[PDB]
Design a protein around this ligand. Structure first.
Ligand SMILES: [Mg+2]
Lengths: 48, 114, 215, 122, 120
RNA sequence: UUGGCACCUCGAUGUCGGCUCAUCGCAUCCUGGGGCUGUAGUCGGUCCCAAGGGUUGGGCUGUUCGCCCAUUAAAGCGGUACGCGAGCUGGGUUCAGAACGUCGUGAGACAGUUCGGUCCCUAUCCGUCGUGGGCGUAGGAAAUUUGAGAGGAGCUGUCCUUAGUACGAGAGGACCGGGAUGGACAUACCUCUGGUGUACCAGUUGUCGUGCCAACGGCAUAGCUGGGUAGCUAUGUGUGGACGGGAUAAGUGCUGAAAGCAUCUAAGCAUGAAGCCCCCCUCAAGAUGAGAUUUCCCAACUUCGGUUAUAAGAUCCCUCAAAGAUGAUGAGGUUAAUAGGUUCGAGGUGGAAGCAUGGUGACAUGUGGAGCUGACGAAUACUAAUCGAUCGAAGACUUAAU
């Protein structure tokens, strides 16, 4: 139950290929033109 | 209701010649026994213990004492094997299922009429 | 010989001629339409494709499988039919007794046939070795620490490996299963329902492929 | 559902007042039995006298159980106690009477002398 | 239904307390899961309020907490009285709804999708 | 197996039984086919072909083993570090305590007994069971697919009939085939029998609180107790291993010579098993050989495509569950029943509250199968799926026909 050997830099960088953050679901707000998250209330204006 | 197609396809199997009763009523159910080479009738007599979901799937249970040995028969309510059910006498209970009669014998299992 | 696409509605019971309780499943087969007639020289094997249910027609900006897409509208309009939801095909049938565009009706089945119902099982999700594989689990007392896990997965130095097919935890369900030698108790032509003795695979609101026993 | 190491009452005047079972005949690995099934058993309480005496090994038939039986029409017959009757290796009883009700399913198993010498067939 | 990562007694209590607070304030801020679960409770209480018969009053008293509101001009009345005198009239003609929900961005301390559940 | 050798391992290769899980050989325990017999058939014995499947539950010992009690068609023999402890136990054995018998003057000792005696580890790699993303399949897509292969099953009893027939002084007593039911085991499902059902109904104890009686809430394992819907389930319900082909094994032959006879063999040609292949269930074109069918999409700048953005199609995002660890799958996003609410109903519980009557009271009766009712069925846009964004073709050569 211990690592029998090192994980080389190649293996490391390989495993984390799919480890990333997604760009937010952002759309432009119709009253102010600033971006907002879709289905949420704009925090700059306060609309829909 | 239940699903409409379930209720439609099984409406013809429902019996209507049957009376209305409730748990606690003591009654006489008659049954076509096709034993031997004859369709005889055995008048089964008991106390209704419970009954379940509607449709062809309603089933009721009746309890009696044969030789000091409790016997209970569950019957589908709409079984065509029952000729008739007579509520021989009514019964004042306060449950919908009467499981608590499996531990009593004699006057302890008493029921008031109406 | 016969085949119909349907979906499972539930189970009930019917009483038989001699009083017997018959356990039954209600299946709803409606507007089954033939959409093609596969042929040996055109496709290499003779069979017919049946579409079941009814989707809505194409609309611009559809966001769900409720409405047909342009690709499917075309396939169904070549059989002058409405877009359908489930499409399967049958090989046991005689391709020449069917025409591209006919309705397959519940009455194809008479009372007392022998049919095979092929559906998909209900999903149980990720499960362990005792529910998924029927394994006896270990002692629950006498100082045991082996309650439900699977036992040895192999031997020792000989086969210093786990062999393929070792029955271990994972997803259960989502498998095509064919129950065989069921029969139909009644066919109702107005509500469009084929009643089949016994029970069939799948969740309620599923899909079953009834055809004639191959045995 | 009757399996080995299950104590049953005897419903007969064989001598045995109460017995327990060892096997359920009928198949390798057979584990349970219901009305109409034969079991090997050894009495544990005998009457003073009687033909069967305490500590004997005997064939016997189940006549009533608490689990009870489904009948082909969806009718179920259940009972308030397990019970059994000794047999003479010919589907015949060892005693001369038989106490208590009996289930109709014993008619099929050709335990007819058991069904004929019974207070109530059910 | 949902469990909200909490036991039964602690949830029963949280749901009824959150419903009471909503009734007091007419719009509150909380996480999606609990808004989605208080929606039904508050909607059903308002139904108990659209009848106003003593039976429904007594039965709605089960859920609401006992709180006092100081209205304008130092007028005081409790949550039951509000429900049955100021909210029954507002929704006498509407046959559902009674509430809306406006998703908001994630909070800072967690990634919880805060929302505002308001009486419509 | 008991050994012999001392070749790897003492900077550690946990050793015996049992549990869980098996897997493989066949010198086969049962089942299938046969030659036989000092085989009349049932009986048994012997040998051959056969490994597809199957090959119990207990009492006694730490025991393997063995004996015994009941069964079964049978209760097979072995390999796998005397399979398997980073899967489990720790009874035996092998630490320190103690004690008896024996040996020793003694400290102590005995593979002589006896009672007691800490089983650690968050899985990196290969392996294995599931489940995603990328890319390739000479355009981009939606659906239906053949099957190269691969996996799973594969067991068998009793009764009746033929038939009390053959065969039998008798006593006993089918072969075949043809019916009917089981055991075990695998699957699917909740209609029935039950189980559970911690946001359903009801009764009840102590105590605190909404001033107060009545009503109700908090806590006491959900305080307890009786029920119980959906879901999930077996012990419950169906289903399955049914036929039937093709090639064979031991074996049985036919015609037939070397060797004018013979003779199963050499030519050839027959028959013959739970065995082989197909047949039956499931997965399967990453089957880089990347397959097939139907449909959908089809322009216009180039200054020469190493080209935008768009089709057809999806996704982002959001309401969800017949699906689910997550992601996937599937039902839906206003041109909308996807979920919540509202209305009606199924099922469950069992006679709500307030009244009036009767009782000293504890209570009872009518209103009124009333009241309540989580997932279950239907209708209804009342509330939320409002707005928007992103990805995604323009189809290579060569040769032959056209
Ligand atoms: Mg080392």
């Amino acid at each position: 139950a211990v690592p029998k050997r090192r994980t080389s830099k190649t293996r490391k960088n390989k495993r984390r290929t799919h480890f990333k953050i997604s760009v937010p679901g952002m759309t432009e707000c119709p009253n102010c033109g600033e971006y907002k998250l879709s289905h949420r209330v704009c925090k700059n204006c306060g609309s829909y | 209701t239940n699903h409409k197609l379930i209720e439609a396809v099984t409406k013809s199997q429902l019996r209507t010649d049957l009376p209305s009763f409730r748990p606690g009523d003591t009654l006489r159910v008659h049954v076509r026994i096709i034993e031997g080479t004859r369709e005889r009738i055995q008048v089964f007599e008991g106390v209704v213990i419970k009954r379940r979901g509607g449709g062809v799937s309603e089933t009721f249970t009746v309890r009696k004492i044969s030789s000091g040995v409790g016997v209970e028969r569950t019957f589908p309510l709409h079984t065509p094997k029952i000729e008739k059910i007579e509520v021989k006498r009514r019964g004042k209970v306060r449950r919908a299922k009467l499981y608590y009669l499996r531990s009593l014998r004699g006057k302890a299992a008493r029921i008031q009429e109406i | 010989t016969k085949g119909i696409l349907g979906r499972k509605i539930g189970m009930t019971q019917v009483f038989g001629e001699n009083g017997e309780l018959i356990p039954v499943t209600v299946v709803e087969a409606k507007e089954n339409v033939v959409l093609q007639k596969k042929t040996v020289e055109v496709d290499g094997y003779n069979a017919i494709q049946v579409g079941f249910e009814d989707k809505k027609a194409y609309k611009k900006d559809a966001k769900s499988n409720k409405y047909a897409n342009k690709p499917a509208e075309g396939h169904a309009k070549k059989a002058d039919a409405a877009p359908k939801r489930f499409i399967r095909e049958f090989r046991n049938v005689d391709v020449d007794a069917y025409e591209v565009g006919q309705e397959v009706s519940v009455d194809t089945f008479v009372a007392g046939d022998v049919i095979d119902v092929t559906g998909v099982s209900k999903g149980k999700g990720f499960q362990g070795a005792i529910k998924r594989h029927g394994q006896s689990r270990g002692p629950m007392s006498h100082g045991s620490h082996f309650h439900r896990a699977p036992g040895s997965v192999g031997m020792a130095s000989d086969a210093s490996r786990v062999f393929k097919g070792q029955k271990m935890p994972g997803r259960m369900g989502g498998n095509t299963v064919t129950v065989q030698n069921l029969e139909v108790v009644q066919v109702d032509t107005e509500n469009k329902v084929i009643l089949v003795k016994g029970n069939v695979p799948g969740p309620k609101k599923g899909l079953v492929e009834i055809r004639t026993s191959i045995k | 559902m009757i399996q080995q190491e299950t104590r049953l009452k005897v419903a007969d005047n064989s001598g045995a007042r109460e017995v327990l079972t060892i096997k359920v005949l009928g198949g390798s690995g057979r584990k349970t039995a219901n009305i109409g099934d034969v079991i090997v058993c050894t009495v544990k309480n005998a009457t003073p006298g009687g033909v069967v005496k305490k500590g004997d090994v005997v064939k016997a038939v189940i006549v009533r159980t608490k689990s009870g039986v489904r009948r082909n029409d969806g009718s179920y017959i259940k009972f308030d106690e397990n019970a059994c009757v000794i047999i003479r290796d010919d589907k015949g009883p060892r005693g001369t009477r038989i106490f208590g009700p009996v289930a109709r399913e014993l008619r099929e198993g050709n335990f007819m002398k058991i069904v004929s010498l019974a207070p109530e067939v059910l | 239904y949902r469990k909200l990562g909490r036991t039964s007694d602690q949830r029963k209590a949280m749901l009824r307390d959150l419903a009471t607070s909503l009734i007091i304030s007419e719009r509150i801020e909380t996480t999606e899961a609990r808004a989605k679960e208080v929606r039904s409770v508050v909607e059903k209480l308002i139904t108990l309020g659209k009848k106003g018969d003593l039976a429904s009053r007594r039965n709605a008293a089960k859920t609401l907490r006992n709180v006092e509101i100081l209205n304008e001009d130092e007028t005081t009345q409790t949550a039951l009285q509000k429900l049955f005198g100021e909210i029954a009239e507002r929704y006498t003609e509407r046959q559902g709804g009674y509430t809306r929900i406006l998703k908001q961005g994630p909070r800072r301390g967690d990634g919880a999708e805060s929302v505002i559940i308001e009486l419509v």
